[PDB]
Amino acid sequence: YASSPGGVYATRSSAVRLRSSVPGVRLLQDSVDFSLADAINTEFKNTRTNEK
Amino acid sequence: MSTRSVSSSSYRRMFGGPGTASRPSSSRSYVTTSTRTYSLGSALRPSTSRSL
C-alpha cells in the first residue's frame, strides 16, 4: 500500500496589517481577537489528536 | 483590522469660526477736529474820533 499525504494546502492569511488610512484616525476598533484564531488552530490540533 | 477611533475631519462644515462679521472700525482713530473759529469782536464797532 502507498497512502498520499497530498491535499494539505495551508492558506496564508494576508490581512492588510495597516490601521485606518495612513497612520491612523482610529485605534480601538481593530478587532483584538486573533489569538482566538490561533487557539482554534490548537483546537484543530487537539481535534486531530481526538479524531484519529 | 479596524479600531473605534473617532473620525472627526472638519466634519461640521469647514468655514473658520462663527465668528467675525467684520464690524466696521470707523476712523475715530483720527484726531478730533480743531474747532478753530474766531470772533472779530473789535472792528465791528469802528471806534474813531471824527472830532478833528
UniProtKB/Swiss-Prot annotation, chain B:
Which stretch of the full sequence is covered here? Answer: 1 to 52 of 466
Tissue expression, as annotated, is: Highly expressed in fibroblasts, some expression in T- and B-lymphocytes, and little or no expression in Burkitt's lymphoma cell lines. Expressed in many hormone-independent mammary carcinoma cell lines.
Q: How does it assemble?
A: Homomer assembled from elementary dimers. Identified in complexes that contain VIM, EZR, AHNAK, BFSP1, BFSP2, ANK2, PLEC, PRX and spectrin. Interacts with BCAS3. Interacts with LGSN. Interacts with SYNM. Interacts (via rod region) with PLEC (via CH 1 domain). Interacts with PLEC isoform 1C. Interacts with STK33. Interacts with LARP6. Interacts with RAB8B. Interacts with TOR1A; the interaction associates TOR1A with the cytoskeleton. Interacts with TOR1AIP1. Interacts with DIAPH1. Interacts with EPPK1; interaction is dependent of higher-order structure of intermediate filament. (Microbial infection) Interacts with HCV core protein.
Q: What is the lineage of its organism?
A: Eukaryota, Metazoa, Chordata, Craniata, Vertebrata
Question: What upregulates or represses it?
Answer: Up-regulated by muramyl-dipeptide and lipopolysaccharide.
Modified-residue entries (Phosphothreonine), positions: T20
Q: Which residues are glycosylated?
A: S7, T33, S34
Free-text note on domains in this protein's UniProt record? The central alpha-helical coiled-coil IF rod domain mediates elementary homodimerization. The [IL]-x-C-x-x-[DE] motif is a proposed target motif for cysteine S-nitrosylation mediated by the iNOS-S100A8/A9 transnitrosylase complex.
Please give the residue ranges the record annotates as the region Disordered. 1-32
What is the recorded name of this protein?
Answer: Vimentin
Location in the cell reads:
Cytoplasm; Cytoplasm, Cytoskeleton; Nucleus matrix; Cell membrane
Q: Which residues carry this modification: N-acetylserine?
A: S2
Q: Which disease is it linked to?
A: Cataract 30, multiple types: An opacification of the crystalline lens of the eye that frequently results in visual impairment or blindness. Opacities vary in morphology, are often confined to a portion of the lens, and may be static or progressive. In general, the more posteriorly located and dense an opacity, the greater the impact on visual function.
Q: Signal peptide: which range, if any?
A: none
Q: PTM per UniProt?
A: One of the most prominent phosphoproteins in various cells of mesenchymal origin. Phosphorylation is enhanced during cell division, at which time vimentin filaments are significantly reorganized. Phosphorylation by PKN1 inhibits the formation of filaments. Phosphorylated by STK33. Phosphorylated on tyrosine residues by SRMS. O-glycosylated during cytokinesis at sites identical or close to phosphorylation sites, this interferes with the phosphorylation status.
Q: Which residues carry this modification: Phosphoserine?
A: S5, S7, S8, S9, S10, S25, S26, S34, S39, S42, S47, S49, S51
Q: What does this protein do?
A: Vimentins are class-III intermediate filaments found in various non-epithelial cells, especially mesenchymal cells. Vimentin is attached to the nucleus, endoplasmic reticulum, and mitochondria, either laterally or terminally. Plays a role in cell directional movement, orientation, cell sheet organization and Golgi complex polarization at the cell migration front. Protects SCRIB from proteasomal degradation and facilitates its localization to intermediate filaments in a cell contact-mediated manner. Involved with LARP6 in the stabilization of type I collagen mRNAs for CO1A1 and CO1A2.
Start-end of Low complexity biased regions: 1-13, 20-32
Protein family according to the UniProt entry: Belongs to the intermediate filament family.
